[PDB]
């Protein structure tokens, strides 16, 4: 009984849709080398 | 239906191609049937768009 979650995923694709999941992944956790990959 | 005990039919649809976003605010192929409502389920290679 709750209807949001097609409202969750509505952006989630769009967010794959995107790819600003990885730039959400970059704050927390960049991509880059730790010393030089 | 072999695990969950129930039953089917089966449609075939009228395009066919992969159904598209019309310019009649509308969907072909399998797509717009069951926007019409008029089947009720479809089982295919489908690249979910939002």
Known sequence: ?37 | AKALGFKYEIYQAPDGRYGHQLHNTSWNGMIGELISKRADLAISAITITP
Do not use: M
């Open chain 1, 1 to 37: 009984g709750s209807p949001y979650r097609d409202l969750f995923s509505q952006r989630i694709l769009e967010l794959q849709d995107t790819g600003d999941l990885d730039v959400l992944k970059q704050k927390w956790w960049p991509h880059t080398g730790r010393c030089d990959l």
